Design a protein around this ligand. Sequence first.
Ligand SMILES: CCCCCCCCCCCCCCCCCC(=O)OC[C@H](COP(=O)(O)OCCN)OC(=O)CCCCCCCCCCCCCCCCC
Lengths: 353, 78, 105, 68, 183, 149, 155, 80, 44, 67
Amino acid sequence: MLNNLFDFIEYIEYWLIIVAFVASVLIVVAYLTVAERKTMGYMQRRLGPNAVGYYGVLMAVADALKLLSKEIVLPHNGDIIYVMSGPLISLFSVLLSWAVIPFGPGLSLLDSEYSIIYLLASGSIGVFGTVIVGWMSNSKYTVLATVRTTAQLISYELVLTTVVFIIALIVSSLNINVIIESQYNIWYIIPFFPLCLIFFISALAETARPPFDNVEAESELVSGHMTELSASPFVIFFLSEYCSMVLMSTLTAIFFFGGYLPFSNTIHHLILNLFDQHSIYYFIIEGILLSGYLAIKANFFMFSFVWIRAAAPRLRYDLLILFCWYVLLPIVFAIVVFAPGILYCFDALPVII
Amino acid sequence: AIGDYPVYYKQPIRWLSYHAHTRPHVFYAIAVAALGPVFMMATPLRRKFLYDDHEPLPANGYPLPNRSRDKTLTGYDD
Amino acid sequence: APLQQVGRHGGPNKCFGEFQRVVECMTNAKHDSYEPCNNLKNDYLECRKHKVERYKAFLMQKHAEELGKDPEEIGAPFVRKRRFLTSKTLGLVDGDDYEIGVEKI
Amino acid sequence: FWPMTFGLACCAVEMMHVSAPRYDQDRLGIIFRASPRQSDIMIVAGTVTNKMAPALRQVYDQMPYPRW
Amino acid sequence: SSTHTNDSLNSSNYVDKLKDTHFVFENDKLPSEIPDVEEVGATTAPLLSAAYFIGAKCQDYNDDFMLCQKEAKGNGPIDCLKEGRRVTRCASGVLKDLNTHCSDEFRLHWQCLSFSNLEYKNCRKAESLLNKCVFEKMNLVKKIPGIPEDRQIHLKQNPVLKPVALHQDSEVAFKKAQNENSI
Amino acid sequence: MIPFEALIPYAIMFAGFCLGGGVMNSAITADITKRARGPNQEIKRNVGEDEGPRNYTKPRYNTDQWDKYFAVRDLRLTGSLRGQSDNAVAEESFKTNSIQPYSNTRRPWVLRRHIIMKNSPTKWARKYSSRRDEREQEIKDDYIRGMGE
Amino acid sequence: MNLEILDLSILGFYSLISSNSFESIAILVATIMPVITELWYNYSQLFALLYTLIYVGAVVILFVFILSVINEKESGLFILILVLLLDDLDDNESNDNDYNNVYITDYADWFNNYNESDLSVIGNLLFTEYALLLLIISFILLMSIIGLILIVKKD
Amino acid sequence: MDLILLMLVAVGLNIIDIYIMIEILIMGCTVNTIYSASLDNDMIGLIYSLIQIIIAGVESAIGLSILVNYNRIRNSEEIE
Amino acid sequence: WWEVKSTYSNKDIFHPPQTVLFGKHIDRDSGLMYANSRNRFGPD
Amino acid sequence: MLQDLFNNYVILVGILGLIFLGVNYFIVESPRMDENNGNISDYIEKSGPFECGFSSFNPIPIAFILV
Ligand SMILES: CCCCCCCCCCCCCCCCCC(=O)OC[C@H](COP(=O)(O)OCCN)OC(=O)CCCCCCCCCCCCCCCCC
């Protein structure tokens, strides 16, 4: 057979694309954990993991497989609901939030003019997943990291939501693809540099990364909510924190560094002229290039997640809630009344072309 | 008054300096925010010196000619 | 007067015309009473819910049942799965019956 | 190989030096964990007093299998 | 705008299941009392490519077709059936001309539109060749009403927003005209 | 002194994005193009000898309501939602294949099955009081009561 | 197989048996999710996302925030299934049979060449036509900020 | 079935459970408005729904603030 | 005695009907990857 | 705009959730295989809180509440 097998592929083709998409995200997340220790290792004059697989390539494999084969500790044998439900919400939200990220023009699973709302809505479901982990527990350390966890995520959600809305206001579109294409002539890091610092600061808090680390602070509250997590509930929750790191690093690339747009249009043009547009080999190269530009921009921020962790001491929680309210929020509302003013003054109010 | 808190209606200039040193989180958020409405007020200056406003978009449906139907229209008939 | 029944694109929607004709009659000055506008009021309600027209569909369904008329031969052909809007069904000359692509536009 | 930070006395100082740059236990996949739930190796580094003994048994019992 | 409606195809088959949508056909053709017309067979991309030439050639009939809708006072579909066939015949006239005068210039342009998300900003090199060809062989021009001639967008020599990726057939055809024509 | 061992994970994360993007750009483009070649499977797969170079169609984004009307209009002409055709005259099957979807207009399931959301002063009168429905049924009855005139 | 029915039957089963406040807050989340999902499909995708952004992201995590503050302290299978089955039988919210059994369509038209999202029109009317409604809302929000602080703040 | 007031069995025995029932009750009103507005292709109904969601949020915040101060009022010894 | 007329009292405004009686279910006997579409124009 | 590709993604992620839970339940060695001392239920020592070793038994600031 050859004719009754081709249509089989055409009936399964769009499932292979999704698996290639999910594998694409998980490979980045899996090797983000290694890159965090490999990078933070070399800034501390260490080496980091280089013994598990040649040069430590199989380090995420060992850590995941080690925990996937640990004894799950349930309060009573049939309490799998309590342990898993917390991390499961967190993992689904951040895996569903990947559905709007485009790897090129139009290459996103969900394309709709409400992509920005879908992205902020999905993240807020993950916030609900985080606080549930401790709220079903009697351990004092685990239940400690709910009231402080709840407000930290609540407080820096306003700042992250408003920043996204200012960029959406400059293009007058809540579509991810339109925002990226709107940055052809200029990258929004040049006009809105302060928002990028505010976006990156807020992004750290939302993922509970240091220096906004007070939730899962080893010296303060041990593993935080994870001091009661082991085996699979630990990995799923740990994976969620690194899906968010990859996502929020990609989102900073999209909103301020042009997304998949090339660093040089000339180099992009010269490279693609070596392939014929009438053969599928041209489109693989463009897709590799366009995701390559995003990957390099995204990698720089996954680097900065680790880089700031190796350079800044952890910030005290009481001084952390007052930072986003008494410093960041007035600035963010000041700009949201500033950008419409400048645009109107020069008759440059945006329209979705 | 080497360090006294200024009174706004007697020392307007020093009152802002006190807040531009001790409350940078308030003074420059107000300064940034006011730069928006200030720029809106300078819109008439731009009209007379830089360029006119663009023509408004044709976002009101099909442009209907303001006249009566043509009577001698022929061609493309059945 | 305030705008009511605004379409999803900023213009008048399906039933705005009927509602406007009602307002013209009710606020008119040449009418002694509201009797002449009673039919226009029904049309605006009709435009929105089609209650009288759905009722007419119910009798034509019920009348055919009492006469034995075959539903497949009095009704109109339809397709329930959008993937099977095949070129054979659409009537194209050399159309296959293989399903169509409704994955990504 | 994730141990549990159970350093008690001067033996713990050498335990931290294994994680120092020169030896770098992390390069072999060794990460000290502060909880029995996330640890599978218990390293008793220091003197076990009578007063500490019941706590050591309790911490040991809370480690999920397999444990060393 | 991707809002769900009751009038066309929706986003997903899960919308159809909730609404219990039936996609209903009607075999009945039009009655013989209405003289037949040959419907336009062009797809989306060719129409967007020839839209401004349909506007230049069928301007009188399009205005008259719309003025019939304005003055029909709600009975537009029924009382403008004859005036609606002139527009269909006029537009078929233009697409038939482009196929018999500028077949390669036309096809190159709407292949570019099918390659670049149906956006006019991405296909200026192919579009400029098509406009130049149409002018000499049919006298049609592209004009955007409401602005001065010097400030039309498609004549902008250095646009701010440019395509990210080039159309090979457009760039190859353009430089050939830089030799054939720019003597 | 650039550490290459430190940058190995990044070169693998760079390949992760490229793997996903390279597949999506090419697979979706190939599928869109293939279905835009003709109305049957024996046309889509094979390439004719007298056919010229293949012009791929890139996936479309940032659409509106006209692109939902254009898509169905293209479907009735070529059998694909993104088919290509520039014939000045359509097929004679174009005049008898308009798809008009008919769907119900019933309230959401949650609005009429939730243990709490369905309880309300007016929702009981819709569900258990005949006052509204007897009044409206008069208008339906008087439709057929007026065909005699 | 309209599976949206089975989600609410499970939901309607646990609403009759919830004891503590953990399950009571669970009924809230278990009700919005069918509301959001049944709005995402069918009726309005814009208001499915507005609900997630405003209800789940804003008012739901406030409940669990104060439950940890308030306290955490402290039927028969025949009657429940009997009640749920009785609740299950009659699910017709309206008694216009033709309105519930006869389907309808709309006809599209090309007169709207300026196609923009619903949120474009809603902003177009809320910031122009009903600017009083918008301004009162910011006034109601203002009173809450004052209202919260006077109720809760100690000194 | 609900004419015997079944929904009273479905509301828990804490003040916070009443607050949730008020939200689930109002949620039904907004869903009804979104349903009508979309069928009619009317954005005025969607303006109403947006107001209902925003007003239903302010009601929650005030109610919780009263409940929070109600709780601390008992636990107000604070003589340590 | 039955009349064929629109359910709209007014007559000088065109109100096309928005209901229909369903007939053949064309894709009823379908499978997967290949509809076994029934003859739309007339019986099988 | 079509979203049948998006739907398959959400369905797959839903399937991925069941896989993560159960893969642990099918790969961990049987309690008899390791030490047999008991299941997580009876072994209440292992199924308990972590209090750094010593067994023990929210009046939060109003400022946190107003936040
Ligand atoms: C991705 C799946 C996420 C959900 C995983 C959990 C699924 C288990 C079924 C619960 C969800 C069904 C929805 C109805 C809520 C019912 C909540 C309830 O009554 O308690 C359930 C849970 C287990 O306790 P149980 O033994 O069932 O009841 C007696 C306990 N004294 O009591 C508990 O509180 C234990 C911890 C459960 C916390 C779940 C939080 C609420 C659910 C939110 C996530 C799912 C959202 C709803 C989606 C489905 C909606 C129908």
